[PDB]
Paper text:
Extensive classification of the data for the mycobacterial ATP synthase revealed the presence of not only the three main states referred to as S1, S2, and S3 but also of substates within them. Substates S1a to S1e are in S1, and S3a to S3c are in S3. In S2 (where there are no resolved substates) the c-ring has traveled two c-monomers further round (ca.120°), and in state 3 substates S3a to S3c have all traveled on to approximately the same position, four c-monomers (or ca. 280°) further on. Again, the position of the PS suggests that the order of substates is either S3c > S3a > S3b or S3b > S3a > S3c. The main differences between the substates within each state are that the positions of the PS and F1 domains vary such that the F1-domain (including the α-helical coiled-coil of the γ-subunit) appears to pivot around the PS during the catalytic cycle. However, alignment of the substates via the “crown” in the F1-domain shows that they have identical nucleotide occupancies and that the position of the γ-subunit is also maintained. Alignment of the substates via the a-subunit demonstrates that the c9-rings and the membrane α-helices of the a-, b-, and bδ-subunits of the substates are in identical positions, as are the ε-subunits, and in some instances the lower part of the γ-subunit. Each nucleotide binding site in the three α-subunits and in subunit βTP is occupied by an ATP molecule with an accompanying Mg2+ ion, while the site in subunit βDP has ADP and an accompanying Mg2+ ion. The sixth nucleotide binding site in subunit βE contains an ADP molecule with neither accompanying Mg2+ nor phosphate.
Residue numbers in the entry:
A (entry chain a): 10 to 247
B (entry chain M), J (entry chain R), L (entry chain S), M (entry chain T): 2 to 86
C (entry chain b): 23 to 60
D (entry chain H): 3 to 120
E (entry chain d): 1 to 50
F (entry chain N), G (entry chain O), H (entry chain P), I (entry chain Q), K (entry chain L): 3 to 86
The structure:
């Protein structure tokens, strides 16, 4: 079997259910990100030779700044740079940590992952996507006031396509979330399926799929961050 | 003596499967074609990216609108199956 | 059912938020300053 | 490598081997390498030609009234006029650019693109 | 349990392919960036001295 | 089992086919027309205003077909013809 | 089972197939013709008048087949052949 | 249940497949031929008469396929072979 | 139930698939070949006669598959294998 | 209550119908594309007709092959149905 | 007959349609986007880095539909809606 | 009665039909497109054939391998049917 | 009276057949289109063969990945059918 949709360490608080495994994975990713951030803050070298951590962080910042400048001037969207970079690093680390060999036997022949990519959980992707949705809608309201922005989004670039435009504002968040979830959820199944093979043959397809999943996770992080920057750019114009 | 609701909901599941199959085919291929246009324009005219992202996104909007209308109707089919007793 | 949301949502959001804050207060500003100085 | 030859109406300006030739035609930007297929194209009003040569800096030439011809062996650029990067004075091209006449404006923009400011 | 050994072997293969093909180019890019920034600083010092 | 169940299942499958075809057609046609428009604007930026006019004609035909299909789906699923 | 139930389910499925095929054909054909029209307009704006002539001929050849498909679906669903 | 019921349901589904395939083929082929014609007219305004004949041959072929399909579907639906 | 009824329904659906696929393939292939011929004639008017030979080869290749499908559908429907 | 071979042969007939549908779609469209390439090449270079037929024949072979293997396997499905107990 | 049996059979067929359509769309869309990227690079090789970004935007937009369909297929197959 | 194995065989035959139909469509279209590219390239350049066969062979292999994988799995479906009791 | 397991596995085989059909179509079409682009590039500019093989292989990865995901989910459908009783 595959036990799709199973969650471990599930608990209850304030009359609400929480998936302990996904919370743990998110906390681990956040800890890694914070550790890298503090490593950078310690090893900043304005005049000295930058360290690998500084090079990585500055590469991310440079790419995101270039994207924003191409879309909308930094002077108009300064916060979008930190938002996009944190989104990108969060998703990238979440996807990449799955490569580590945390898969074992479930005592019934069904594989169990000690660490599972949080993006495979609908709550994680929904949190990210809805936060971004609220963020750039608030930014658009701020640019075009509390009233002007709704008319602009409804009318879009051509007014007479107002209905379709409405659908767009519904499609942007959903497409932002589900996509990511899918691309990670699929992984959570592939490895599981590969686990059905005997070890002496299970090793190889697992290696191939995980090696490809590394690039898939990098691509997904890049796409999600780029589309976030892009939706911000759309929401803040005129 | 099959449960009428059982037949109805199985038919609804097959119908929604068709809805999303068609929607995904259309959306994927239309987005791919619009992207072909976009990358071609960027390669030929590097400075035209800003003036191209608008029409490309309008056409992508129409393409995605079709797909997500299909999404809404598939959700109606499976969760609020019309005609189900 | 795995597609349904949960309380985890809020928790995840909170975690993301704090990370964002850190990145906005101890990573992006110093890095942008370093690039500007360079 | 490919034999670049920048040929003006009055005199063959430049010649010699090169590894890459970047330019901008009416269809769009184009890059030419040793065995590029035979080609005939028209350079844009404010075209610029970048020539990357074996172990040398890129030769940036502003071109006015340009035509590109890629042969089985050689790449020839026929220019009504052309100017190597070193010979452009910034202020003159700046003032000529954003003018009324189209020829002078295009020539100034080509000079600017050669300079490296765009 | 057997799947555990299988995925350990898979991860060993992943680590080998990484360290053998991905590490060299990324390390070279890192060294190129470090050398470029070091050269920029050296040029700044030389220009100030000049 | 009552015949109404079979008729409703058939209607649902028919509507599924209707909207699958409609979405395929709409997506492909809109993508192709948008590709043409992007290529046109990729060369002559000022051409955008005059290009919108035929582009919207194409989009109207495509979406006209799609929405006819939608109307027939609504007829199939909500008021199923022949529903005994 | 009521035979008319089977007949109506089959008729609904067939009509759905008819409309799905017609939708795909109409949408994609209109998209391709509109792509041609858009490219032609982009290359030379003045040509619009002469371009709209063959474009309408193509649109007719496509939409006529689509509407024939629609009519045959209408036959299938409302007045089902061999309804019995 | 009447065997003729199953026969007629199968015939209706088959005819729907016939019409869907014919619709898709006719729409795509006519759209492509019209794209060729429109591009030719755009490039050469005076080539209308020269191009009509090739375009008509292409149409003729596509529409012949469509009409053969329609005839076979009519045979399927109104004169179902194997009916009993 | 009568086995012949199930067999005939299956054969009718199969033949409908035969001809639907044949229709799609023939229509699209003929459209593409006609597009090529129209473009060639527009570019090179004098080659109008010369181009038909490869065009006839292409159309023959497409119609070969189409009519093979037609014959096999006739086999499926009129003389259904496995009837019993 | 019905003959198992009856439903088995019905399924085999539907399967073979799919075999031919896919084979015909692929063959027709691929041959159309290859012929379009051949026509464009002949129009562009009149004297290349002698040399173009080689790659054209290779492509047509690669397409009609797939088609005829599909035909053979449909014949297997119908005339000698696997698992026709 | 067990209702859940027919429910799950219908759900499996539905999910098969879901992800088959998704796979077709993703394959063709990635093929087309990669074709555009490869042609652009072949024109000007050092446009490679400049072109990956729109290429990945297009790849994301295409894969969106495919992976949304994959998620809904997982819902269909693993948590079947309306499964008595 | 409706012998279970008969239903299994019918489903397997239809599944093999679908597998082969999709495989044939993919193979035919892909080979046709690759051959179109090859024919155009050879038409432009006489001697290009020698170097063009290499990428053309790569594409043909990548497409035909996908088709033959479907072939093998159809053979699995109709000869060793999974889940058959 | 039908064995529910037989219905489940018949539906599973149909679904797997659809999955393979769609995946094969997608992989074939995408690989053919990418190979057409590669052949056109090699014909136009042979010296950029190495530079072109990179985006070509990226596209082939992005296509074959979806294809093999379809393969894995189909193997799930047929060999370990979800919902099997």
């Amino acid at each position: 079997a595959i036990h799709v949709g199973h969650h471990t360490l599930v608990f209850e608080l304030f009359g609400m259910t929480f998936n302990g495994d996904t919370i743990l994975a998110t906390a681990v990713t956040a800890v890694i990100v914070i550790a890298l951030a503090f490593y950078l803050r310690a090893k900043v070298t304005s005049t000295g030779v930058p360290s690998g951590v500084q090079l990585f962080w500055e590469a991310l910042t440079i790419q995101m700044r270039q994207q924003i400048e191409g879309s909308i001037g930094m002077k108009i969207a300064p916060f979008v740079l930190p938002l996009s970079v944190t989104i990108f690093v969060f998703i990238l680390i979440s996807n990449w940590l799955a490569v580590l060999p945390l898969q074992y036997g479930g005592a019934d022949g069904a594989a169990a992952e000690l660490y599972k990519a949080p993006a495979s959980d609908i709550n994680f992707v929904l949190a990210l996507a809805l936060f971004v949705f609220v963020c750039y809608h608030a930014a658009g309201i701020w640019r075009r006031g509390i009233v002007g922005h709704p008319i602009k989004v409804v009318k879009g670039h051509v007014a007479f396509l107002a209905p379709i435009n409405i659908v767009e504002e519904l499609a942007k968040p959903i497409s932002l979330a589900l996509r990511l979830f899918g691309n990670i959820f699929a992984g959570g199944i592939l490895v599981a399926l590969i686990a059905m093979f005997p070890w002496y043959i299970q090793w190889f397809p697992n290696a191939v799929w995980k090696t490809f999943d590394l690039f898939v996770g990098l691509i997904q992080a890049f796409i999600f961050s780029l589309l976030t920057i892009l939706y911000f750019s759309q929401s803040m114009e005129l | 003596d099959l449960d009428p609701n059982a037949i109805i909901t199985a038919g609804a599941l097959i119908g929604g499967g068709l809805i999303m199959g068609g929607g995904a085919i259309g959306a994927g291929i239309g987005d791919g074609i619009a992207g072909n246009a976009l990358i071609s324009g960027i390669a030929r005219q590097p400075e035209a990216q800003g003036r191209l992202f608008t029409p490309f996104f309008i056409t992508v909007g129409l393409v995605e609108a079709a797909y997500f209308i299909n999404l809404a109707f598939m959700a109606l089919f499976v969760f609020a199956t019309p005609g189900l007793q | 059912n795995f597609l349904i949301p949960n309380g985890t949502f809020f928790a995840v959001l909170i975690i993301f938020l704090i990370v964002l804050g850190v990145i906005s207060k101890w990573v992006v500003p110093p890095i942008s300053k370093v690039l500007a100085e360079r | 490598d490919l034999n670049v030859e920048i040929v003006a109406v009055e005199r063959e300006l430049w010649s010699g081997p090169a590894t890459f030739v970047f330019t901008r035609t009416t269809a769009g930007e184009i890059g030419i390498l040793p065995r590029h297929i035979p080609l005939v194209a028209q350079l844009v009003d404010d075209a610029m030609v970048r020539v990357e040569r074996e172990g040398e800096d890129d030769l940036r030439i502003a071109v006015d009234g340009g035509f590109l011809s890629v042969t089985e062996e050689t790449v020839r650029i026929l220019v009504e006029n052309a100017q190597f990067e070193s010979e452009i004075d910034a202020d003159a091209a700046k003032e000529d650019a954003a003018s009324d006449d189209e020829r002078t404006a295009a020539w100034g923009r080509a000079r600017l693109r050669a300079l490296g400011q765009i | 349990m057997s799947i555990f050994i299988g995925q350990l072997i898979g991860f060993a293969v992943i680590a080998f392919i990484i360290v053998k093909w991905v590490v060299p180019p990324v390390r070279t890019l890192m060294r190129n960036q470090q050398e470029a920034v070091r050269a920029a600083l050296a040029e700044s010092a030389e220009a100030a001295k000049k």
